[PDB]
Structure formats: structure tokens, C-alpha cells
Design a binder for this molecule. Structure first.
Ligand SMILES: OC[C@@H]1O[C@@H](OC[C@@H]2O[C@@H](OC[C@@H]3O[C@@H](OC[C@@H]4O[C@@H](OC[C@@H]5O[C@@H](OC[C@@H]6O[C@@H](O)[C@H](O)[C@H]6O)[C@H](O)[C@H]5O)[C@H](O)[C@H]4O)[C@H](O)[C@H]3O)[C@H](O)[C@H]2O)[C@H](O)[C@H]1O
Ligand SMILES: [Ca+2]
Length: 415
């Protein structure tokens, strides 16, 4: 008779997986009915923001770790600490500490104190390569541990870029990376970032940042190891990767079900190519599962969040359905070692989590508007109409004003 609203986002394979697992929850808890509100990833932020603006908050919902402090200040998230402590069996200490701590807040800083959510997952963003394509081309396979240098990466990408059917037109390319999701690793491995150490000053005008951004754009425009601008418009590079047209493309654990369904070639994971630091870099994503401060059924709502995040039965179902890696550290370690589950080097996901993955810069700031502004007007750089140097000099003060406002608005909302 109890009814909960569960609001979340996902690609089609993720929507199916979580709907299936919510049904398992309902089977286990016959007195609870869960009403689903689900959107595409791109639609989610707008829809959640509207719910919160109207103070019509779903009982259980996904949220961005960068919004944690703002959600606490505006009393959006229930303090679920005591419900989790009283729960039968589940020990959050089995779960990735990096994941759990993103949703703790002690009143002053993130990473400690009361629980205001549970981790949906950790989302290490690995680099995949098309092994079928390498072996057909006679090119030595990438090393599973030692990153390519940037020059080595371009060299191999050039070797892979060719006319394979002999009609005179290129139909296979080295790569086709999306700057929204893959620029970070190049910036970070080149010893740069969007913001400084203190997370209060924009640093995109760092020569190291400029070099990374120019290199990124140059893959398409200068080195020409990607589909052309027109070709990517015709069919985007994610789809071209699925069809076996690209040598390299990123892989997150949420991709695995989609790739199981659509990818017919053999692929495996490798470290990202490394810039001046010689150390690979990429991001580790996460989403939180939160409970509305205003929920009429806090026990049942926390029980649902726990089922998805930490319950061994719920987690097993999500992992079996190939939309994430295990939240339990020990389960993830034995998962990675199981050779019957592909990719062969899915250990790379854990290496990202444990060693060379970083957080998105917005996880450190009170809101992410300053960062969104960088990407909003980036495309002319990517299409070779504006230099990286010219763009970051123009973007920097716009970004800085927004970041300054985030910092101030924190001070005001936290009183
Ligand atoms: O800019 C050029 C564009 O390319 C063309 O569009 C094609 C695009 O390709 C398709 O997208 C493929 C997917 O994109 C990458 O995945 C990125 C995002 O990950 C998924 O979410 C997983 C989720 O996020 C992780 O957390 C990350 C962050 O961490 C926190 O700070 C914050 O809260 C999180 O946001 C979690 O760990 C994990 O659960 C999203 O689904 C996806 O967007 C992968 O390559 C593919 O999965 C799609 O069709 C187009 O977007 C166009 O021409 C042009 O726009
Ligand atoms: Ca051809």
C-alpha cells in the first residue's frame, strides 16, 4: 500500500536493467509499490531541477555529487544515516569508500559525517581498442599497462586510417573522441586542469591546458585520424565505433550491455595515452541515490536506495545485466579476475578507480555553471575555426565570473 516515486536516468539498456531490479525489490517488499519516472541522460538535469524548484521531490532519485552541498543547504536530501545503520545486514564498508564518501557531509565539508545518499556506482571511463581491426592490419597490439605517448597514439591512429574496401574512400579511422567526455584525460595527463588546486581560480589559459586542447582538436583537423566533420555529422563516432569503423573509443561499465548487443568485433581495454606527465589519466564518474527530505516513507525509500546500491541481490542483478561494475570492492576484484567475462582487461576499470582516475572539476565547486560555459562555446575550436589559445583567453573571464558566483552563493546559502 506504500507508494514511492523513483526518478532516474539512463540509456535504454540501463532503463531496462533498473526497471527489472525495481521489480525484484517489489517482489521482496510486496507492501511497496515503486512508481518510475525515467528520462534520457541529457533530459535528466532539467527535469530534476524542475521537481526541486516546485518542491515536488521524488522519494528516491539520482543526483550529481557536485550538487550535494547545495542540496543539503536547500533541504533537498534526507539525512539517511540512521536508516542505513539500522538496516539488516548491509555493511557500507564493503562498498567503495571513494563512492560512499562522495555523499557524506558533516555540515562543512564533503567526504565525512552524515550520509545524504548512496552511490549508484563508480564509473571509470576506460579506453577501448578494436582488436579485430589491429590484427587484420598487422599492427602490434597496444600494451595493457604502458600508455602510448601522444605521438605514438597519433602514429598508430594514422596506420589504422584507411580505405579498407578499395572504393577510393576512407572508411576506417584511428579514433573519433568526443571532447565532452574524453578531453579531461589529455588535460590531466599533461599536468593541467580547468581550475587550480584551491578550486577557486580558472586555469584553462595554462599553456599545458592549451596544448592538450589543441592536440585534441588536431586529431580531427590536423592529424586527420578521425572521420571528417561532415562524416561525424552523418553518423556520430559512438555509432561508428559500434559498427567497427574506429580503432579506439572509450568504454564505461554502463556501456557493456549495449556493446554486448551491438559490437561484433573483439575489443579490450588499455590505459589512455599520456601527455607530459607520462601518467595516464581519465575520470571516475558517480551518481548518488538520494531520498527526498520530504518523503512520507523514509524507511521504505532508504530500503530502495540500499537495494540498488549495496544489497548483494540487487547489485548482483545490476552487474549481471552488464550496466555497472560491482559496488562491493571484494566482489569487483573477483569479477575483474573472471576471464569468462569480457573485456579481458576489465581490471583496467579497477586500476582507474584505485590509481589514475580523477573527479570531474565540478565535483569540487558549489555548482557547475563555470564548467558548462567552457563547453558551450567549444565547438569552433574542435572544428578548427578558432585556436585553443584564442578560445581559452576569451572563455576564462566568463568562467571565472560564474565560479566566483558559485563560491559566493555557497556562502549565502550556507548561513
Ligand atoms: O560533442 C559531440 C557529440 O557527439 C554526437 O553525439 C554522440 C553521442 O554519443 C552517444 O553517447 C555515447 C556515450 O557517451 C559516453 O558516456 C558519457 C556519459 O556517461 C553515461 O552516464 C554514465 C554515468 O555517469 C557517470 O558519472 C559521470 C559524472 O560523474 C559525476 O561528476 C556526475 O554526476 C556524472 O555526470 C556514472 O558513474 C555513470 O553511471 C551517459 O549516458 C553518457 O552521456 C560513452 O562514450 C557512451 O556511453 C550519444 O548518442 C551522444 O551523446 C553529437 O553529434 C554531438 O553532440
Ligand atoms: Ca572505402
Amino acid at each position: 500500500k506504500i507508494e514511492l516515486t523513483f526518478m532516474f536516468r539512463g540509456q535504454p539498456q540501463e532503463q531496462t536493467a533498473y526497471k527489472n531490479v525495481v521489480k525484484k525489490f517489489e517482489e521482496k517488499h510486496p507492501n511497496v509499490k515503486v512508481n518510475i519516472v525515467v528520462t534520457s541522460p541529457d533530459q535528466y538535469a532539467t527535469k530534476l531541477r524542475a521537481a526541486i524548484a516546485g518542491r515536488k521531490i521524488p522519494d528516491v532519485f539520482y543526483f550529481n555529487p557536485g550538487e550535494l552541498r547545495a542540496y543539503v543547504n536547500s533541504n533537498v536530501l534526507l539525512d539517511i544515516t540512521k536508516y542505513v545503520e539500522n538496516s539488516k545486514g548491509v555493511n557500507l564498508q564493503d562498498i567503495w569508500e571513494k563512492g560512499v564518501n562522495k555523499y557524506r557531509f558533516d555540515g562543512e565539508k564533503v567526504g565525512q559525517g552524515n550520509l545524504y545518499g548512496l552511490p549508484k556506482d563508480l564509473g571509470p571511463f576506460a579506453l577501448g581498442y578494436n582488436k579485430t581491426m589491429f590484427e587484420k592490419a598487422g599492427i602490434p597490439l597496444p600494451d595493457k599497462d604502458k600508455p602510448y605517448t601522444w605521438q605514438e597514439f597519433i602514429d598508430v591512429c594514422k596506420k589504422l586510417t584507411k580505405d579498407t574496401n578499395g572504393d577510393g574512400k576512407l572508411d576506417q579511422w584511428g579514433t573519433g573522441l568526443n571532447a565532452t567526455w574524453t578531453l579531461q584525460g589529455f588535460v590531466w595527463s599533461n599536468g593541467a586542469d580547468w581550475i587550480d588546486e584551491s578550486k577557486t581560480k580558472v586555469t584553462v589559459d595554462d599553456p599545458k591546458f592549451i596544448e592538450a586542447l589543441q592536440f585534441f582538436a588536431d586529431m580531427q583537423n590536423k592529424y586527420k585520424v578521425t572521420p571528417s566533420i561532415a562524416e561525424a555529422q552523418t553518423l556520430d563516432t559512438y555509432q561508428r565505433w559500434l559498427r567497427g569503423q574506429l580503432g579506439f573509443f572509450p568504454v564505461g561499465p554502463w556501456d557493456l550491455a549495449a556493446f554486448d548487443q551491438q559490437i561484433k568485433f573483439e575489443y579490450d581495454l588499455i590505459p589512455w595515452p599520456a601527455g607530459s606527465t607520462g601518467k595516464p589519466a581519465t575520470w571516475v564518474g558517480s551518481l548518488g541515490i538520494g531520498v527526498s527530505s520530504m518523503t512520507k516513507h523514509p524507511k521504505e525509500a532508504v530500503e530502495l536506495a540500499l537495494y540498488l546500491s549495496a544489497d548483494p541481490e540487487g547489485q548482483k542483478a545490476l552487474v549481471d545485466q552488464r550496466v555497472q561494475l560491482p559496488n562491493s570492492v571484494k566482489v569487483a576484484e573477483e569479477w575483474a579476475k573472471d576471464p569468462s567475462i569480457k573485456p579481458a582487461n576489465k581490471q583496467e576499470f579497477l586500476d582507474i578507480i584505485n590509481d589514475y582516475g580523477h573527479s570531474f572539476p565540478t565535483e569540487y565547486t558549489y555548482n557547475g555553471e563555470w564548467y558548462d560555459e567552457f563547453y558551450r562555446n567549444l565547438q569552433p575550436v574542435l572544428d578548427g575555426k578558432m585556436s585553443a589559445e584564442e578560445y581559452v583567453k576569451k572563455a576564462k573571464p566568463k568562467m571565472q565570473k560564474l565560479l566566483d558566483q558559485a563560491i559566493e552563493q555557497e556562502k549565502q546559502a550556507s548561513k
